[PDB]
Ligand binder design. Structure first.
Ligand SMILES: CCCOc1ccc(-c2csc(-c3ccccc3Cl)c2CC(=O)NC(=N)N)cc1
Length: 368
């Protein structure tokens, strides 16, 4: 796993990517590591934001699947041609796998200017793969074609003209103990489509939001490296901001700030201590057992800073601001996701991101 440490990079807010190669000879590309989707999709045609793309004609091992894929979503869309080719991760397991590849031929609002990645590596399950679940996801092909164990770890570390550079590690097939400190707590993967989990309770600076369990997962809750913010269902979001505004209160802020769209600055003078910590209690492996994940303002305020907690209409999304500061294990083989305090992770001399348990919680089976 030493070879996989720091194999991730990105620009704050533009996602983390790992270097991959596709085709023969090897075509080097930077791929967004996304646990919130299940397709291995790469630009395969010129685009204003792409400085390089996958060229099937140059790959002697490319095999067309004669089959298209169309993916529209609210902001725009991407469209591609299904194919198969040899795929490797230079700073990952020393193996090469034949995987499905969605060659993006046209798109709008898919790629991001300056993000430095040319495709996406959807690490979620087949159920949500496009165009349907018969298109085996990359990780599935990896495990089926190799000896690599059905599990991967993600240590997202976070972080002037330039958006800040972020780094992290994607350990495939295992758990690197030097990457975390303390104990690893696991929450069950409720269902194998998105990496769905169940939040049983949340508190702002030790104070319980006292909401019905179901509201925390209203619709669903997922662990998604492909999302920057901690996104909360409306009701939970409103309750969370009110509580945070209170905690901060000694400074007031433009609510354009609270809405994530606008920024805020001081100049190492930041009054972190004024902002409360956020604890998300996740269902434990044992019925009435749960554990908490606690994040600092250093995590939900991303650098000037922008409030990185936003409203969701699609359930809770534990994105980067949540994952950063924790070592997250996607234990697919045991249908669970483990959290441990990250070897990296920003923290002052008064508080620290934490992973603690157990905490017992009555019902919770019914938080789903
Ligand atoms: C931190 C920046 C992340 O940048 C992104 C770039 C593209 C997409 C995206 C466009 S269409 C699409 C997509 C939508 C449905 C199925 C397949 C794909 Cl590739 C995705 C993946 C996605 O939605 N991931 C996610 N929510 N975690 C998402 C984030």
């Amino acid at each position: 796993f030493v070879e996989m440490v720091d194999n991730l990079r990105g620009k704050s807010g533009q996602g983390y990517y790992v270097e991959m190669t596709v085709g023969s000879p090897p075509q080097t590309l930077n791929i967004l590591v996304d646990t919130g989707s299940s397709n291995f999709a790469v630009g395969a045609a010129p685009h204003p934001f792409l400085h390089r793309y996958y060229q099937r004609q140059l790959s002697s091992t490319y095999r067309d699947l004669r089959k298209g894929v169309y993916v529209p979503y609210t902001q725009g869309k991407w469209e591609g041609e299904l194919g198969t080719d040899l795929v490797s991760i230079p700073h990952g397991p020393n193996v090469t796998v034949r995987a499905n590849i969605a060659a993006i031929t046209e798109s709008d609002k898919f790629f991001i200017n300056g993000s430095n990645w040319e495709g996406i590596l959807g690490l979620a399950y087949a159920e949500i793969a496009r165009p349907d679940d018969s298109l085996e996801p990359f990780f599935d092909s990896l495990v089926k074609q190799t000896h690599v164990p059905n599990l991967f770890s993600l240590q997202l570390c976070g972080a002037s003209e330039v958006l800040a550079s972020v780094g992290g590690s994607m350990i495939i097939g295992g758990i690197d103990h030097s990457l975390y400190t303390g104990s690893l707590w696991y929450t069950p993967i409720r269902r194998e489509w998105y990496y769905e989990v169940i939040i049983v309770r949340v508190e702002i600076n030790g104070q319980d939001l006292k909401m019905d369990c179901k509201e925390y997962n209203y619709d669903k809750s997922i662990v998604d490296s492909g999302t920057t913010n901690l996104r909360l269902p409306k009701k939970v979001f409103e309750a969370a901001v009110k509580s945070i505004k209170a905690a901060s209160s000694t400074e007031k802020f433009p609510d354009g700030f609270w809405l994530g769209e606008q920024l805020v600055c001081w100049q190492g003078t930041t009054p972190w201590n004024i902002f409360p910590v956020i604890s998300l209690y996740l269902m434990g492996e044992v019925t009435n057992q749960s554990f908490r994940i606690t994040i600092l303002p250093q995590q939900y305020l991303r650098p000037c800073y922008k409030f990185a907690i936003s409203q969701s209409s699609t359930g809770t999304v534990m994105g980067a601001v949540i994952m950063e500061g924790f070592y997250v294990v996607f234990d697919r083989a045991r249908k669970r996701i483990g959290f441990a305090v990250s070897a990296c992770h920003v923290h002052d001399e008064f508080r620290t991101a934490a992973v603690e348990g157990p905490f017992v919680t009555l019902d919770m089976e019914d938080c789903g």
